[PDB]
Ligand binder design. Structure first.
Ligand SMILES: C[C@@H]1O[C@@H](O[C@H]2[C@H](O[C@H]3[C@H](O)[C@@H](O)[C@@H](O)O[C@@H]3CO)O[C@H](CO)[C@H](O)[C@@H]2O)[C@@H](O)[C@H](O)[C@@H]1O
Ligand code: ZN
Ligand code: ZN
Ligand code: ZN
Ligand code: ZN
Ligand code: ZN
Length: 428
């Protein structure tokens, strides 16, 4: 049980005679590093060795490698709310839960994000960004085809048929072969793939109920040309999203900043809209986001400073402002100083990039509608492996996503059983 209190954390910042060196690994270096530099300017006794680990997939592999070796482990490591679980459960991350941290830091982060940095009763990071889904819509393409900005999945299907019949070089959307992209869609329609009761007790529902109905719908979209299966955040995707291959793109809202940075030619052409409803339920959403975690290997005498750094970077009012100023005037932060500020909710676009200037209001409404009735499995790294091996190959116009989900569930059941988890599935 961690005895580093909220007061001990604050003392690491005030006790400036106690010099500390922290090694920090991050994959979102572009967005985060300027605010890291601001930390170092403000607290020169805490020196940050900031390591840009490149792409997230490489970062997580590198971190697992050093943890398994028990050598050369960073003190602080970027995590995300749907990838940290297997690191937390395996003991790679410091569980810094205690009453005083819980009491103090729970007030600093919006409740949806704060819940998600817990796992199995431990506390494993400070939330960084929230990532409510938004639908980035090429309004120019829809206008050309006399199509409305879609508000539901039913609209995506019916309008997507018309679009692709009239212009077979464009699709209404992409079904991205990425575990976050894919699970975000299920979460955003209230379709549980699984339920976690405790660290060693899980239920898989990948082939029944609302999940099965949604999978059937996605396969019909693939079969009929409404969605195209493909990768996201690859060169293939980058070409497509620049060329207008997808009239809609339903994604975590950090993409809103990515378009401003990588796609200047799309200025004025997109509207940012709410993600779609399903079956005449009110629309729901999903938020994941990054978090900053401390390694279990972090030396005891550096832990207070490591926690002080993660809390400062992710919640200090100056830090939150830096996140805005260094990311085109907006970055969607989980800290309550951002989330509870009506002027962030009503913040108007000033750069002319999106065709609607109320982008943050769309993001905030989506955040309000995040589906919190959800947990990630303890072995999310294995989930991603099985997804790549079993589900991704079926994401095509002749695929069988329904059958693939059932086979993936069987593989995850065997993995769970082999690793000491109690597991039920809807196939039992
Ligand atoms: C790993 C993801 O972390 C969160 O998303 C962050 C987003 O991550 C992207 C990486 O920067 C990129 O290298 C590659 O791995 O794609 C990732 C998206 O899946 O990066 C932005 C900045 O551009 C933010 O830092 C996001 O927090 C999380 O929300 C995702 O679901 C993933 O777990
Ligand atoms: Zn150093
Ligand atoms: Zn708690
Ligand atoms: Zn067209
Ligand atoms: Zn390629
Ligand atoms: Zn400050």
């Amino acid at each position: 049980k961690s005895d580093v209190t909220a007061q001990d954390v604050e003392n690491a910042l005030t006790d400036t005679s106690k010099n500390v060196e922290l090694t920090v690994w991050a994959y979102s270096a572009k967005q985060m590093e300027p605010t890291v530099k601001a930390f170092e300017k403000k607290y020169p006794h805490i020196k940050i060795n900031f390591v840009n680990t490149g792409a997230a997939e490489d970062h997580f592999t590198k971190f697992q490698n050093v943890v398994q070796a028990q050598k050369d482990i960073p003190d602080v490591v970027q995590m995300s709310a749907n990838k940290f679980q297997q690191f937390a459960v395996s003991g790679a991350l410091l569980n810094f839960a205690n009453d005083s941290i819980e009491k103090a830091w729970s007030k600093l982060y919006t409740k949806t994000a704060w819940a998600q940095v817990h796992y199995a009763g431990g506390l494993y990071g400070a939330p960084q960004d929230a990532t409510p889904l938004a639908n980035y819509v090429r309004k120019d393409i829809l206008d050309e085809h006399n199509l409305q900005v879609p508000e539901s999945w039913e609209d995506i299907y019916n309008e997507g048929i018309k679009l692709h019949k009239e212009d077979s070089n464009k699709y209404m959307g992409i079904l991205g072969s990425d575990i976050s992209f894919f699970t975000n869609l299920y979460r955003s329609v209230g379709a549980r793939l699984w339920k976690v009761n405790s660290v060693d007790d899980v239920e898989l529902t990948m082939n029944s109920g609302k999940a099965k109905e949604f999978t059937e719908f996605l396969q019909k979209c693939l079969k009929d040309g409404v969605l195209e299966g493909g990768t996201v955040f690859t060169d293939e995707f980058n070409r497509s999203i620049n060329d207008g291959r997808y009239a809609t793109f339903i994604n975590e809202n950090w993409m809103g900043n990515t378009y401003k940075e990588q796609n200047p030619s799309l200025k004025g052409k997109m509207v940012v809209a709410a993600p779609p409803s399903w079956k005449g339920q009110p629309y729901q959403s999903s938020s994941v986001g990054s978090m900053m975690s401390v390694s279990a290997a972090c030396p005891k005498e550096k832990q207070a400073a490591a926690l002080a750094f993660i809390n400062w970077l992710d919640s200090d009012k100056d830090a939150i402002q830096s996140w805005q100023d260094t990311n085109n005037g907006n970055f969607f932060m989980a800290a309550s100083v951002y989330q509870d500020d009506e002027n962030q909710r009503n913040k108007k676009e000033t750069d002319g990039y999106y065709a609607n200037d109320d982008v943050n209001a769309v993001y905030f409404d989506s955040m309000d509608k995040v589906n919190t009735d959800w947990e990630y499995l303890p072995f999310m790294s294995q989930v991603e492996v099985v997804f790549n091996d079993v589900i991704v190959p079926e994401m095509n116009e002749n695929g069988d996503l329904v059958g693939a989900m059932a086979k993936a569930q069987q593989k995850l059941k065997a993995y769970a059983e082999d690793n000491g988890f109690k597991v039920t599935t809807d196939a039992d």
